[PDB]
Amino acid sequence: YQEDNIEAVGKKLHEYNTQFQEKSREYDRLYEDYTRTSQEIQMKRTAIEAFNETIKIFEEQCQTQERYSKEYIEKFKREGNETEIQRIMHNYEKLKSRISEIVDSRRRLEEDLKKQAAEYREIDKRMNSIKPDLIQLRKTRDQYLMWLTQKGVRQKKLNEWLG
Amino acid sequence: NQSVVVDFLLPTGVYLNFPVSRNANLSTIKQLLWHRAQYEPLFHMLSGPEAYVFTCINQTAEQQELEDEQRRLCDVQPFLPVLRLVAREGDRVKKLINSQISLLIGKGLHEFDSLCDPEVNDFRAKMCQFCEEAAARRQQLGWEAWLQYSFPLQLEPSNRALLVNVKFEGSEESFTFQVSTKDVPLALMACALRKKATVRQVEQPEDYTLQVNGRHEYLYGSYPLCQFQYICSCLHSGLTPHLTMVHSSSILAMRDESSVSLWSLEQPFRIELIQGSKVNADERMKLVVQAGLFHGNEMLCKTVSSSEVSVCSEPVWKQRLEFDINICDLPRMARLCFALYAVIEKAADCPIAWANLMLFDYKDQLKTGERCLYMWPSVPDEKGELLNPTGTVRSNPNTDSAAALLICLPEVAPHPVYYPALEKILELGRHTEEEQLQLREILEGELYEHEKDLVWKLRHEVQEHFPEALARLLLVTKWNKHEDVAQMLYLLCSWPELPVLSALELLDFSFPDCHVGSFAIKSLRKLTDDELFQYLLQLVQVLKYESYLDCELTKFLLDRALANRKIGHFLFWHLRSEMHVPSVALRFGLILEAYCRGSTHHMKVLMKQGEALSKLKALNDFVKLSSQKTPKPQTKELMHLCMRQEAYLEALSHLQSPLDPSTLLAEVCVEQCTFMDSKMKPLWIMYSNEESVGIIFKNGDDLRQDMLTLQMIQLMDVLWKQEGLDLRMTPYGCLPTGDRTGLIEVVLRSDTIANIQLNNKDALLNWLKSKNPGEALDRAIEEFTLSCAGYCVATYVLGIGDRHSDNIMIRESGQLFHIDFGHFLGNFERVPFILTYDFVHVIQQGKTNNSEKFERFRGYCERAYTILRRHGLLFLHLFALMRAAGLPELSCSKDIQYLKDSLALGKTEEEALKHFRVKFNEALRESWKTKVN
Ligand SMILES: Cc1ncc(-c2ccn3ncc(-c4ccc5c(c4)[C@](C)(Cc4ccccc4)C(=O)N5)c3n2)cn1
């Protein structure tokens, strides 16, 4: 139209509160990893931008080297100073191989960001699997507490069970 | 090791690679480069070293032209050690400031461009323009006006003799002479000037200003001398004021160091839920999307739900979700809110993530077309609501990895449709004693449904007779009806100006409408700089409830930051300390950029602070790492060796304190520096300048809670002092500066109760006697009594438990104060009022029964409590706004309810005071019983 003894319900209130506190501490730990990883992924993403901008500067240097050197390569060829041409070109070769080192460093970081992106997703997945238990344990704890309050159980007795 | 291999790109295209010291400055590196470059091809075509500037990529991924060549390479912190020589010429002022802003705000300005967001671009263009104009206008002002901007008066909340030591600038010769306590500063200046004349003899008194020795604090204006905090502090302590006469020129030297209405569209509002992306859910479960339309915290109509599709990474829906409201009835701040749920198949639902969307844009256009809403993950909290309407309308900036919902807003008309302009709103908006008696009692507790319909009918009566009840009338207004919205806004436009107290309530998330916030700010423009500063923390937090970037509150805060440098200082740090929080990084970064452009002088001060703070972080990280390995004396010595490195010592020395920019942190007393034994190993950093000051750097805890508590205690102190009650409080500085990072002011000449008691004993009372021998003991006891009452009432009202010998301190003056406010509002049940037996004993002068003294102490407690009750609504409104902060212990109406009960606001004053008396007496009874155990 509109189910147990008090000591038995209180024991179960104590158990469910203890299970809720543990599940909360598990969630809080995961949320901390979630927070830490989100910050770290952001830092790596700005680091990749920094690599990009570094590589860009080096490619401007290559452009500059090629336009600027031409006249002096031609001038030293007329004057027979082919050793000075060889110095300019060997110096430019050193520039090029330094660009390959930096590109390789950018690649290592892109692969690290890839791994940590998957970690972020796995952390979020674990959080989302914990939430049902966490929420269900909170609601169950509150129902036992209300049942006992209805039954007229004093606050001091409720406090012993709640931790 | 010391050296580092640096790549050098010459403008001829030539490339050099060689080691330089990490400590070497760029000017020295440029010399080493020039000496090596002469043995490389194409040297002869280079101009001289001074024709070029180094460029690098810095930590924020931006190119930076390194104009200051006295900077060490380790300070410049280039992403990779790559320095490129480029031509100096161009707009080097704008280049330099742009680069400094990026480093200072902790976010590269390029990240704002990369968004390709017109709202962002319009904000920066408009706000940076306004801030620069104020800065230029400020520069054209006289030396007095600039002094008022940069060093505003530090006055007590507010006749005997007083001798002051006056000195002149660039002269060790000083003058001691008598001055009346009620003299104006100008009279003191005219006196010292005559004694300077009486030696060549002439200058005028108006051309001078007075400075507190070793501080950027200045005594000027029409106020009497005792009203200045420095003088008031000097008068009470008994020390003689030490002032310096400074000339006008010396202050100028510092300065120059179309045819379719919205109301015609009667079709229902609807959306197309297309697809979700990068979902991380339980594969056995199914996915659901709850959608709902909101205005503030009120639902405009029923929540419509999607169909159930299987859990995968990339779920597809393609459903026309239709809502029970017409397009014509959507209010200006109508808010589409989503929540993604993983649900068990029908044969505890998981809230996965949520996202909100303004239906109208920043230019008032009703949005059409596709949107990609990058979601925020749902946190399971106590009040598990279906949706999160209070949450931010900004997108999750982790677009790489965060879950997304793709939606489509359909085309409502052939041409774009705007929310009607104010003129059309006011055009549509125009047009008994029993029900007048019913209104009276209703307004003298949120209203029930039957009461709402009466207040709405008598809304014209509410404007005329109960103007203070605007907040109540706005909540009863039906924001899902444009006729009612039009009528409410018609009244709002003619509504009389409300007091500051009422305006603070209207800044809360319940009142999202732009006209309401605008009316609120209008009422807050009355605020003095001193009062504003008391509410600054709260006004910053309510920016998190704003929908658009360009808003009245942002404009107001920048206005005040540009007119007062102290306000700008603390506005900067309140915004800066939250730049790590992705929901506010964009909004706060944009305000910081605009602020910086209007504040080039303070930029330089803030830069020095940021670098100090960055060194302290690394110094503290070393100490955490060392403390777990070795014993403390060795770690302390290793701390000092790390500190005495040139780059560390220079970065840590000669800065204005973040806690108080008028205080100069001059020379680091490295031997006096140490760290504390708590979990995070907070650093204790001592400085010396000209009459010792200390700061605690703490990294690992969020100090915002502590700052809030200390600000409330400071507000209490002001409110008490305003009624002539000085309870001798020590509301010491606490400032969050970064991610779980902040500074705490050291109170010197103080110890913990535990240390004093450690050495039924008279240990506390003997310590006072040893520090205040003979005639000074009575003063000291009175200082203890006054401060004990203030902190007894403060801790009770705020619900601060865990108060013990380790976190209560005493100054040698006698003043008692509390430290470490990690818990409040009854967190660790109601925290009872608490009297300590050992403190009663000091209040009774070491006697068993001293009723005269004890009754005076009781009186102070009772008067303190009574004054706070009179300003109870101020505390409630301020705390209500602080719910935006997201502090775990200030999240809900229960937390606010704690303050209502402790201040007994539901009771009459007589009733409140009688209950407080019973609580007091019961605390005295308890005081006896606690120490016997
Ligand atoms: C969260 C939070 N909030 C506020 C404060 C806080 C704020 C201001 N002040 N002003 C003095 C102290 C202070 C605290 C503890 C102790 C001391 C002083 C001495 C007497 C001196 C000492 C200092 C360092 C290492 C060793 C000894 C001691 O022995 N213990 C202090 N604390 C701290 N933490």
Side-chain angles (χ1 to χ4, degrees):
Chain A
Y1 186 97
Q2 276 182 36
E3 69 175 334
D4 212 342
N5 67 86
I6 290 178
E7 195 63 26
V9 179
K11 262 200 174 180
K12 283 196 284 152
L13 169 63
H14 183 87
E15 288 162 335
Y16 285 128
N17 195 63
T18 304
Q19 284 173 30
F20 171 73
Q21 287 176 188
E22 277 169 33
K23 274 280 176 170
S24 286
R25 282 194 279 93
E26 195 180 356
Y27 181 81
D28 289 5
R29 182 175 173 182
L30 276 175
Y31 198 87
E32 198 180 317
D33 290 333
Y34 165 86
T35 299
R36 182 186 51 77
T37 298
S38 287
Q39 289 176 205
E40 284 178 15
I41 286 170
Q42 187 199 311
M43 286 173 64
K44 289 184 163 69
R45 198 183 165 187
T46 62
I48 287 165
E49 289 163 36
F51 271 119
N52 183 64
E53 209 74 19
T54 305
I55 291 168
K56 189 168 174 179
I57 280 188
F58 271 88
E59 290 176 332
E60 285 172 55
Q61 190 78 344
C62 287
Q63 187 182 8
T64 299
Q65 198 285 339
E66 289 188 316
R67 192 181 66 260
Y68 187 80
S69 64
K70 275 169 182 180
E71 291 91 331
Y72 295 94
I73 298 299
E74 290 183 317
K75 190 170 173 62
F76 287 133
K77 196 175 178 181
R78 297 157 195 178
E79 301 297 317
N81 197 354
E82 295 197 334
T83 53
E84 190 63 41
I85 292 164
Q86 194 151 28
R87 293 173 85 215
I88 292 165
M89 297 314 302
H90 186 253
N91 187 277
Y92 184 39
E93 290 290 300
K94 284 186 281 184
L95 183 63
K96 290 178 189 189
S97 52
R98 178 55 185 153
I99 293 176
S100 288
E101 292 173 1
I102 296 178
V103 170
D104 188 32
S105 296
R106 166 166 180 171
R107 179 196 62 76
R108 290 196 222 96
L109 197 62
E110 285 166 5
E111 290 185 323
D112 292 320
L113 169 55
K114 194 185 173 193
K115 287 181 178 179
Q116 197 167 46
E119 287 172 28
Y120 167 93
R121 289 189 71 171
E122 183 60 53
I123 289 168
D124 192 52
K125 189 166 184 180
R126 280 184 196 182
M127 285 197 316
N128 290 327
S129 59
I130 283 179
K131 280 180 214 180
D133 296 329
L134 188 62
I135 291 169
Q136 184 61 78
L137 284 166
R138 192 205 298 282
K139 293 177 173 177
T140 299
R141 196 276 314 285
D142 294 8
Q143 277 183 319
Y144 277 64
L145 196 54
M146 294 281 285
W147 187 97
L148 295 163
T149 302
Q150 280 163 19
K151 287 286 191 186
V153 181
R154 298 179 190 276
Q155 193 60 56
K156 293 182 180 180
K157 198 79 196 73
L158 298 175
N159 292 340
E160 290 172 36
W161 293 315
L162 294 164
Chain B
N1 296 27
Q2 296 186 330
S3 300
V4 59
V5 184
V6 180
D7 298 320
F8 298 92
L9 308 182
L10 304 193
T12 57
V14 171
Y15 162 74
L16 293 80
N17 184 239
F18 60 89
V20 304
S21 181
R22 283 170 172 175
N23 294 4
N25 66 30
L26 297 165
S27 193
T28 284
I29 293 169
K30 201 189 263 177
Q31 281 186 355
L32 296 158
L33 174 58
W34 247 256
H35 180 78
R36 299 226 196 184
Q38 70 181 300
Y39 300 112
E40 293 291 347
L42 307 162
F43 181 71
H44 49 301
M45 299 301 159
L46 296 167
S47 284
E50 299 175 47
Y52 304 95
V53 63
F54 282 129
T55 297
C56 73
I57 310 310
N58 69 27
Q59 296 302 301
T60 68
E62 295 192 343
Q63 281 189 60
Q64 179 176 3
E65 282 184 31
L66 302 170
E67 175 155 23
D68 186 352
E69 304 191 328
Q70 298 297 107
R71 297 284 287 168
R72 302 182 182 80
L73 183 59
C74 60
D75 296 325
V76 170
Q77 293 188 81
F79 180 65
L80 287 169
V82 182
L83 297 177
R84 190 198 190 176
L85 289 174
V86 302
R88 292 194 172 286
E89 290 161 63
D91 190 5
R92 281 196 294 166
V93 165
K94 285 197 188 180
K95 294 273 177 65
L96 179 49
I97 299 171
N98 285 326
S99 276
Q100 283 176 352
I101 289 174
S102 287
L103 291 168
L104 192 56
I105 80 179
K107 193 188 182 66
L109 295 182
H110 84 275
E111 298 186 2
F112 304 135
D113 294 295
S114 300
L115 297 157
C116 307
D117 192 330
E119 188 178 13
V120 174
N121 301 335
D122 295 13
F123 181 93
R124 299 176 71 198
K126 184 189 173 172
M127 290 298 101
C128 297
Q129 177 57 35
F130 180 78
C131 289
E132 287 171 354
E133 285 182 62
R137 175 164 55 261
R138 181 205 298 143
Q139 196 65 31
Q140 297 186 328
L141 301 175
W143 66 272
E144 294 188 323
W146 198 80
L147 202 65
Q148 194 174 323
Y149 161 73
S150 60
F151 307 119
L153 297 174
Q154 299 176 54
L155 298 162
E156 289 291 320
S158 65
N159 181 50
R160 291 186 294 94
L162 184 63
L163 70 89
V164 57
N165 184 289
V166 184
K167 160 176 159 180
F168 287 83
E169 205 186 358
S171 180
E172 292 191 325
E173 190 170 34
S174 56
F175 305 88
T176 309
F177 54 88
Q178 66 181 35
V179 175
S180 299
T181 208
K182 301 190 174 179
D183 284 324
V184 161
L186 185 144
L188 193 154
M189 294 195 300
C191 190
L193 188 58
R194 278 190 295 279
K195 286 281 173 179
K196 189 170 170 61
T198 312
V199 178
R200 199 72 182 267
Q201 73 170 26
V202 58
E203 288 80 14
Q204 296 182 328
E206 296 187 323
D207 292 37
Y208 292 97
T209 198
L210 284 164
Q211 186 188 358
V212 175
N213 287 19
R215 268 181 65 77
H216 296 309
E217 182 179 346
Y218 292 81
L219 288 63
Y220 58 89
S222 42
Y223 298 91
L225 279 160
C226 61
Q227 284 189 231
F228 294 87
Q229 293 183 22
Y230 174 66
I231 298 297
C232 185
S233 181
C234 286
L235 283 167
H236 195 99
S237 296
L239 297 170
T240 60
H242 274 46
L243 305 179
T244 295
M245 296 272 285
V246 184
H247 200 267
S248 306
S249 56
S250 193
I251 302 302
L252 293 168
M254 288 186 184
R255 193 190 72 184
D256 310 329
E257 189 173 310
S258 300
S259 63
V260 181
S261 292
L262 185 67
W263 297 337
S264 60
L265 295 167
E266 303 200 78
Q267 294 292 325
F269 177 86
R270 43 161 147 280
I271 201 164
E272 280 176 38
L273 176 61
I274 299 161
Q275 193 197 292
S277 297
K278 293 173 190 172
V279 179
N280 307 303
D282 201 317
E283 293 188 322
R284 295 173 281 94
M285 300 189 197
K286 304 298 185 293
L287 277 165
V288 191
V289 173
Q290 257 68 23
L293 288 169
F294 290 82
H295 187 249
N297 204 46
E298 286 273 34
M299 281 184 188
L300 295 169
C301 59
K302 200 181 284 185
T303 60
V304 184
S305 301
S306 88
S307 186
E308 304 189 337
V309 183
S310 297
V311 161
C312 61
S313 185
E314 310 298 316
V316 183
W317 280 279
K318 294 186 169 63
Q319 297 188 262
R320 195 190 204 176
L321 289 177
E322 187 175 301
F323 296 82
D324 204 320
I325 182 165
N326 296 343
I327 293 171
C328 56
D329 301 315
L330 288 169
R332 181 66 191 75
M333 312 302 294
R335 198 193 211 75
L336 186 63
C337 303
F338 292 95
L340 179 59
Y341 280 97
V343 191
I344 196 69
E345 189 176 14
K346 191 173 169 181
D349 288 353
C350 175
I352 304 289
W354 64 270
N356 299 339
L357 182 73
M358 300 300 289
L359 296 171
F360 295 81
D361 76 353
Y362 81 104
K363 290 181 157 171
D364 316 329
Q365 200 194 321
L366 178 69
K367 290 174 191 177
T368 62
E370 288 200 345
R371 302 286 163 170
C372 194
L373 303 185
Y374 296 94
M375 297 187 295
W376 302 94
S378 306
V379 182
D381 77 307
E382 291 174 40
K383 292 187 178 181
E385 298 189 324
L386 295 169
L387 293 148
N388 190 30
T390 63
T392 182
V393 292
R394 190 59 53 177
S395 209
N396 188 334
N398 185 11
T399 56
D400 195 52
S401 304
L405 276 184
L406 199 72
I407 54 168
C408 198
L409 300 175
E411 295 187 327
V412 302
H415 264 74
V417 292
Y418 293 98
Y419 191 92
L422 185 55
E423 294 94 320
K424 293 205 184 182
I425 296 165
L426 304 193
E427 274 170 37
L428 194 73
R430 286 177 294 181
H431 296 298
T432 62
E433 186 51 50
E434 196 71 32
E435 67 204 336
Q436 278 172 28
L437 193 68
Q438 293 167 38
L439 188 64
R440 289 264 175 193
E441 66 184 315
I442 285 163
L443 305 174
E444 290 181 7
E446 201 186 322
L447 297 176
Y448 303 96
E449 293 293 312
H450 63 106
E451 299 171 348
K452 292 184 174 180
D453 293 36
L454 180 60
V455 180
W456 175 248
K457 283 171 180 179
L458 313 194
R459 64 185 175 277
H460 290 276
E461 310 311 313
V462 176
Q463 188 184 43
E464 195 192 339
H465 299 307
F466 309 90
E468 293 189 325
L470 177 53
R472 292 153 157 282
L473 179 56
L474 293 163
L475 294 162
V476 312
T477 309
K478 292 171 180 181
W479 296 94
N480 63 355
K481 290 183 181 295
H482 70 276
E483 44 260 289
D484 294 13
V485 177
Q487 286 169 320
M488 178 49 40
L489 291 170
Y490 175 64
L491 297 171
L492 187 58
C493 291
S494 68
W495 207 277
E497 188 183 325
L498 296 187
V500 162
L501 191 56
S502 298
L504 289 164
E505 180 174 40
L506 294 160
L507 298 177
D508 209 348
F509 67 90
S510 313
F511 312 101
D513 190 275
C514 42
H515 301 92
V516 176
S518 177
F519 178 93
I521 295 310
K522 181 173 78 172
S523 296
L524 291 184
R525 293 192 212 277
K526 286 199 293 300
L527 285 168
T528 59
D529 287 339
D530 291 343
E531 201 179 341
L532 174 57
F533 186 66
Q534 210 69 59
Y535 316 143
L536 189 56
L537 180 58
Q538 284 68 49
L539 295 180
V540 169
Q541 298 300 318
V542 299
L543 295 164
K544 302 187 191 172
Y545 293 152
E546 296 288 349
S547 293
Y548 307 113
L549 301 169
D550 186 9
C551 62
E552 286 287 298
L553 175 53
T554 293
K555 182 61 177 299
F556 176 71
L557 287 178
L558 285 167
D559 262 316
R560 305 299 295 249
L562 299 166
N564 182 304
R565 189 178 175 162
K566 179 178 175 179
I567 286 164
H569 176 81
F570 289 102
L571 182 61
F572 171 89
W573 285 114
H574 297 335
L575 302 164
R576 187 62 188 81
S577 63
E578 301 229 74
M579 292 298 296
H580 69 283
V581 179
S583 57
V584 299
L586 178 56
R587 182 186 285 279
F588 280 15
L590 291 167
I591 298 160
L592 289 166
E593 190 201 353
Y595 162 76
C596 285
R597 291 184 193 285
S599 317
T600 44
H601 300 91
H602 204 59
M603 270 204 315
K604 295 183 179 180
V605 173
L606 299 172
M607 282 163 58
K608 282 188 176 179
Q609 292 174 358
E611 289 164 17
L613 287 166
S614 193
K615 296 297 184 199
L616 290 165
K617 177 55 166 78
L619 185 60
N620 207 155
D621 283 2
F622 176 80
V623 171
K624 286 175 176 176
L625 186 60
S626 179
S627 295
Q628 60 169 27
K629 298 178 181 180
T630 54
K632 178 158 189 172
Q634 296 177 31
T635 299
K636 190 177 169 173
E637 290 275 31
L638 289 165
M639 185 187 157
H640 297 172
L641 291 164
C642 186
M643 285 180 85
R644 285 190 252 258
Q645 291 178 130
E646 287 175 39
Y648 269 80
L649 202 70
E650 196 83 330
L652 292 173
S653 299
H654 300 293
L655 62 159
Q656 300 191 179
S657 171
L659 292 161
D660 181 14
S662 55
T663 309
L664 287 161
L665 310 175
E667 309 285 14
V668 178
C669 307
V670 173
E671 207 68 42
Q672 296 164 35
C673 299
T674 183
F675 65 97
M676 321 197 319
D677 299 324
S678 46
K679 287 182 179 180
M680 305 304 185
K681 306 298 186 297
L683 305 190
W684 172 277
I685 309 297
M686 290 308 299
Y687 289 88
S688 59
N689 189 40
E690 284 195 330
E691 295 187 319
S692 188
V693 192
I695 61 179
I696 292 163
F697 175 84
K698 194 152 172 168
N699 174 251
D701 294 323
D702 176 23
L703 295 172
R704 281 187 306 159
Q705 184 59 83
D706 298 72
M707 179 180 49
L708 176 57
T709 298
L710 285 155
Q711 175 190 302
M712 291 299 165
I713 291 170
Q714 207 275 337
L715 174 54
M716 286 172 179
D717 191 53
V718 169
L719 293 174
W720 293 329
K721 281 179 177 166
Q722 280 174 183
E723 307 296 331
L725 189 69
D726 187 354
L727 289 187
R728 306 300 302 151
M729 306 298 278
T730 306
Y732 57 82
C734 180
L735 188 66
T737 56
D739 187 0
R740 301 175 194 181
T741 304
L743 295 177
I744 299 169
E745 172 178 25
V746 171
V747 178
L748 295 163
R749 298 181 167 180
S750 76
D751 212 343
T752 66
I753 295 285
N755 287 349
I756 296 166
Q757 293 184 325
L758 178 59
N759 180 229
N760 305 335
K761 300 178 201 179
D762 298 39
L764 207 162
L765 186 50
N766 286 334
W767 183 87
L768 287 166
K769 283 164 179 180
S770 72
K771 301 296 182 185
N772 299 274
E775 295 274 31
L777 186 58
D778 292 307
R779 291 183 176 180
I781 287 175
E782 185 64 15
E783 296 275 303
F784 182 99
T785 309
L786 292 159
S787 69
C788 190
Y791 284 103
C792 282
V793 174
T795 53
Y796 168 64
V797 170
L798 303 175
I800 305 173
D802 200 40
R803 303 323 303 168
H804 47 238
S805 63
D806 287 60
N807 67 22
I808 300 178
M809 296 196 73
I810 315 189
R811 286 213 257 172
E812 292 176 10
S813 75
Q815 287 163 302
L816 169 146
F817 67 99
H818 287 241
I819 61 169
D820 199 319
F821 306 104
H823 294 282
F824 78 166
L825 307 181
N827 290 297
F828 52 88
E829 296 186 322
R830 291 181 183 178
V831 174
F833 189 88
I834 283 170
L835 288 165
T836 317
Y837 179 92
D838 298 348
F839 305 167
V840 176
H841 188 75
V842 172
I843 292 170
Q844 289 177 188
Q845 303 165 301
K847 301 183 184 180
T848 317
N849 188 64
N850 189 352
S851 76
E852 185 235 288
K853 293 291 181 180
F854 189 74
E855 293 269 34
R856 282 176 61 190
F857 166 73
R858 190 206 315 270
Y860 298 149
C861 295
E862 288 176 359
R863 194 180 173 183
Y865 186 65
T866 305
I867 294 162
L868 299 193
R869 285 195 73 260
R870 290 190 181 94
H871 300 101
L873 275 167
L874 185 53
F875 286 101
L876 297 179
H877 294 338
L878 286 175
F879 270 77
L881 298 186
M882 277 306 286
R883 292 170 66 184
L887 297 171
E889 305 192 353
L890 182 51
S891 70
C892 59
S893 59
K894 192 186 176 180
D895 295 316
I896 298 290
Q897 185 67 57
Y898 194 100
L899 269 174
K900 292 182 196 195
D901 301 334
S902 75
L903 287 172
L905 300 180
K907 302 179 183 290
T908 69
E909 183 168 288
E910 268 168 38
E911 283 177 351
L913 200 67
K914 292 181 179 189
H915 213 131
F916 188 79
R917 278 158 183 174
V918 165
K919 288 173 169 292
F920 190 96
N921 290 342
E922 199 58 30
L924 185 65
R925 190 175 185 78
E926 196 62 42
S927 177
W928 194 97
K929 297 202 181 181
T930 307
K931 204 188 168 184
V932 178
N933 183 47

